[PDB]
Amino acid sequence: RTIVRFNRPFLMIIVDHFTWSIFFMSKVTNPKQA
């Protein structure tokens, strides 16, 4: 069973399939960062 655990910094790229727009791009280095 493959496990995918986002418990360290990761990137998130929110994309539109119609226009191929990147709506949002994000790096989560600390979900609780000030």
Binding site: R1, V4, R8, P9, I13, D16, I22, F23, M25
Partner: protein, 339 residues
């Protein structure tokens, strides 16, 4: 919607990302590339000569293969597509211009602003700077459903014009997380430091997946109901900077073309809300957008005279990830003074 808009806007997204991380290497990043692209394209509507060329090149358009007229038509088409009605996900993008009542504007500029960018022109009394600040922030608050409240922090009382773009996004996961499965768990800031976060989980999921061994990262695509989805890229421990330096349109396309469906035993994803505010002046200058800020600024397509210059471009964005879906919003403002 068209391939050359998407290619320039994606190139711009990753160029902007890389400059934000160079500026603040220890911080979360959240921004909307398409908001910033649209705001600056809107600005270019009024630019001439080197001011214009710098903006369009900074936005990563290949001017030997496209023209400003084709560029604006492409943004018009995008805004129409993004703002279509949907019974599945909420997505909205708006543009506006706030202008000192007595500033004389070319009729062609105001007409093209409304026709191409969907922008109204709000007469605004910038000498009553607190009231002008509140009107612009209220417009953004309305468009973002209360998510972006303080886009404008300071407004020079001698401002002539502010161009504003906002984007609002709210979507449900196609496969939502059950909050009964969300548990406090470690999120490792580094090999030896962590924080405790609510860790959501999904079990026995079949999703598109790619292990990129050359870049030491794992890529999965999670889907929203509707036309949007999200690439999650998980670098191995301490490999984030290596993955970041490989971010590009080429790499994103390769990742998209390399995904295969895989049964995942358990996927763990934090529930989190993050937000960031930016002064984009130094970033835009690194991207070659320079004359618009200077006394050589040429915005004579707005007024007919070379009497306006950009003072500051700001951006704010918020991202909320939780069991039912995602909500994200952002806005971009171009502040313009007399020259």
């Amino acid at each position: 919607v068209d391939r050359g808009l998407a290619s320039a806007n994606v190139d711009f997204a990753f160029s902007l990302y890389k400059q934000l991380v160079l500026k603040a290497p220890d911080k979360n990043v959240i921004f909307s590339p398409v908001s910033i692209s649209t705001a600056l394209a809107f600005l270019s509507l009024g630019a001439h000569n080197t001011t214009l060329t710098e903006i369009l090149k900074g936005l990563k358009f290949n001017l030997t293969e496209t023209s400003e007229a084709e560029i604006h038509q492409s943004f018009q088409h995008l805004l129409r597509t993004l703002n279509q009605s949907s019974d599945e996900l909420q997505l909205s993008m708006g543009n506006a211009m706030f202008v000192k009542e007595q500033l004389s504007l070319l009729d062609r500029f105001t007409e093209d602003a409304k026709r191409l960018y969907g922008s109204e022109a709000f007469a605004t009394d910038f000498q009553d700077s607190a009231a002008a600040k509140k009107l612009i922030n209220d417009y953004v608050k309305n468009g973002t459903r209360g998510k972006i409240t303080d886009l404008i922090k300071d407004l020079d009382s001698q401002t002539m014009m502010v161009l504003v773009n906002y984007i609002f996004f709210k979507a449900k996961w196609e496969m939502p997380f059950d909050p009964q499965d969300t548990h406090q768990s470690r999120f490792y800031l580094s090999k030896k430091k962590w924080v405790m976060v609510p860790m959501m989980s999904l079990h026995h999921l079949t999703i598109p997946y790619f292990r990129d061994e050359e870049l030491s990262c794992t890529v999965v695509q999670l889907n929203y109901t509707g036309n949007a989805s999200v690439f999650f890229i998980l670098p191995d421990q301490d490999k984030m900077e290596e993955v970041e330096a490989m971010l590009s349109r080429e790499t994103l396309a390769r990742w998209g073309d390399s995904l295969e469906f895989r049964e995942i035993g358990e996927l763990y994803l934090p529930k989190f809300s993050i937000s960031r505010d930016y002064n984009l002046n130094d970033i835009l200058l690194q991207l070659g957008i320079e004359e618009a800020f200077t006394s050589k600024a040429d915005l004579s397509g707005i007024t007919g005279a070379r009497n306006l210059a950009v003072s500051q471009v700001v951006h704010k964005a918020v991202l909320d990830v939780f069991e039912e879906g995602t909500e994200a919003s952002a806005a971009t403002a171009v502040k313009i003074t007399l020259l």
